[PDB]
Amino acid sequence: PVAKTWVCSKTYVTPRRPFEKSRLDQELRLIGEYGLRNKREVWRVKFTLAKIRKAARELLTLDEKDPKRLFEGNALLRRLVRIGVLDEGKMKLDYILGLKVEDFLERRLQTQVFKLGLAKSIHHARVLIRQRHIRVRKQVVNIPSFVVRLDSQKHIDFSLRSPYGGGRPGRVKRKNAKKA
Amino acid sequence: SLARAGKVRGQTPKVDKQEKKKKKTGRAKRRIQYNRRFVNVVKKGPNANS
Amino acid sequence: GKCRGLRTARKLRNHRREQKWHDKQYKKAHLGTALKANPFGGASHAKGIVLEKVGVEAKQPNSAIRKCVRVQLIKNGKKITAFVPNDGCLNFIEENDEVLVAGFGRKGHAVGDIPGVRFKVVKVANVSLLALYKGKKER
Amino acid sequence: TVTVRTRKFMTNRLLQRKQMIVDVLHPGKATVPKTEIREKLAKMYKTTPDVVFVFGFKTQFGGGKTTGFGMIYDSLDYAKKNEPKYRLQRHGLYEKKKTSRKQRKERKNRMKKVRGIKKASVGA
RNA sequence: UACCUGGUUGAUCCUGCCAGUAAUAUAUGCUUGUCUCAAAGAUUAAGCCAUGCAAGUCUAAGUGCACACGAGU
RNA sequence: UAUCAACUUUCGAUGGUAGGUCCGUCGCCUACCAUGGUGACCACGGGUGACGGGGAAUCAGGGUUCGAUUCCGGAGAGGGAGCCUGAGAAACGGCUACCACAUCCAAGGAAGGCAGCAGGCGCGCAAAUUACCCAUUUCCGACACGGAGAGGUAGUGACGAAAAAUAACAAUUUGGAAUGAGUGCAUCCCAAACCCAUGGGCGAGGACCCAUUGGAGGGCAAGUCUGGUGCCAGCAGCCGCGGUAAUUCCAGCUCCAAUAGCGUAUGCUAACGUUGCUGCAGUUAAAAAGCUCGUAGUU
RNA sequence: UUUACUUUGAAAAAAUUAGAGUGUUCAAGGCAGGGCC
Nearest to A28 among B26, B27, B33 (CB): B33
CB atoms closer than 10 angstroms to residue B3:
7
3-class state of residue A144 by DSSP: coil
In chain A, count H helices and then E strands. 7, 3
Spatial distance between the Cα atoms of C93 and C69, rounded to a whole number of angstroms: 9
Q: b vs e for D9-22, b when ≥16 Cβ sit within 10 Å of the residue's Cβ?
A: eeeeeeebbbbbeb
Dihedral of alpha carbons A150, A154, A160, A161, sign: positive
Spatial distance between the Cα atoms of A153 and A147, rounded to a whole number of angstroms: 10
3-state SS, chain C, equals: CCCCCCCCHHHHHHHHHHHHHHCHHHHCCCCCCCCCCCCCCCCCEEEEEEEECCEEECCCCCCCEEEEEEEEECCCCCEEEEECCCCCCCCCCCCCCEEEEEECCCCCCCCCCCCCCCEEEEEECCEEHHHHHCCCCCC
Q: Which amino acid type is present at position A86?
A: L
Q: Solved how?
A: cryo-EM
3-class state of residue D23 by DSSP: strand
**For residue A59, what are the CA distances in angstroms to A62, B26, D118?**
6, 40, 79
Dihedral of alpha carbons D32, D36, D40, D42, sign: positive
Half-sphere exposure of C118 (CA within 13 A, CB side): 11
Within residues 55-94 of protein chain A, the ones with CB less than 7 A from nucleic strand E are none
Cβ of A101 near strand G (under 7 Å)? The reply is no
Helices (H), chain D: 34-44, 76-81, 85-89, 102-112, 119-123
Cβ of A22 near strand E (under 7 Å)? The reply is no
B6 and C65: CB-CB below 8 Å?
Answer: no
Resolution (A): 2.4
Confirm if C91 and C70 have CB atoms less than 8 A apart: no
* Chain B touched by A84 (CB under 8 Å): no
Half-sphere exposure of D70 (CA within 13 A, CB side): 29
Confirm if B29 and B22 have CB atoms less than 8 A apart: no
3-class state of residue D104 by DSSP: helix
Closest CA to D13 of D72, D99, D66: D72
Q: What residues of chain C lie within 8 A of the CB of B10, using their CB?
A: 88
Spatial distance between the Cα atoms of C45 and C119, rounded to a whole number of angstroms: 10
Secondary element (H or E) of residue D49:
none
DSSP string, A85-143: SS-STT-SGGGTTT--HHHHHHTBHHHHHHHTTSSSSHHHHHHHHHTT-EEETTEE---
Strands A139-140 and C127-128: unpaired
3-state SS, C30-62, equals: CCCCCCCCCCCCCCCEEEEEEEECCEEECCCCC
Question: Testing the interface with D: which of A136, A139, A141 to mutate, by most D Cβ within 10 A?
Answer: A139
Residues near A149 by beta carbon (within 8 Å), at least 6 away in sequence: A82, A83, A84
Within residues 56-115 of protein chain D, the ones with CB less than 7 A from nucleic strand G are 60-62, 67
Closest CA to C67 of D69, A73, B1, D66: B1
Rounded-to-10 torsion of CA C22, C26, C32, C36: 120
Spatial distance between the Cα atoms of A161 and A177, rounded to a whole number of angstroms: 19
Cβ of D43 near strand G (under 7 Å)? The reply is no
How many residues are listed for chain D in this entry? 124
Spatial distance between the Cα atoms of B42 and A87, rounded to a whole number of angstroms: 40
Chains in contact with D, where contact requires at least 3 CB pairs less than 8 Å apart: A
Q: What residues of chain A lie within 8 A of the CB of D61, using their CB?
A: 139-140, 142
Give the CA-to-C1' distance from A12 to E30 in angstroms: 25
Give the CA-to-C1' distance from D83 to E65 in angstroms: 39
Looking at residue B18, what DSSP letter applies? P
* Greatest C-alpha distance within chain A: 76
Question: Testing the interface with B: which of A37, A120, A122, A128 to mutate, by most B Cβ within 10 A?
Answer: A37
Looking at residue D56, what DSSP letter applies? E
Q: Which amino acid type is present at position B8?
A: V
Closest CA to C133 of C99, C100, C88: C88
3-class state of residue D111 by DSSP: helix
Asked if omega into D84 is within 30° of 0 (cis), the reply is: no
Spatial distance between the Cα atoms of A139 and D59, rounded to a whole number of angstroms: 12
Spatial distance between the Cα atoms of C108 and C114, rounded to a whole number of angstroms: 13
**Torsion angles phi and psi, residue A174, rounded to 5:** -75, -20
Question: Testing the interface with C: which of B1, B2, B4, B12 to mutate, by most C Cβ within 10 A?
Answer: B2
* Chain A touched by D30 (CB under 8 Å): no
Closest CA to B2 of C91, C51, C123, C115: C91
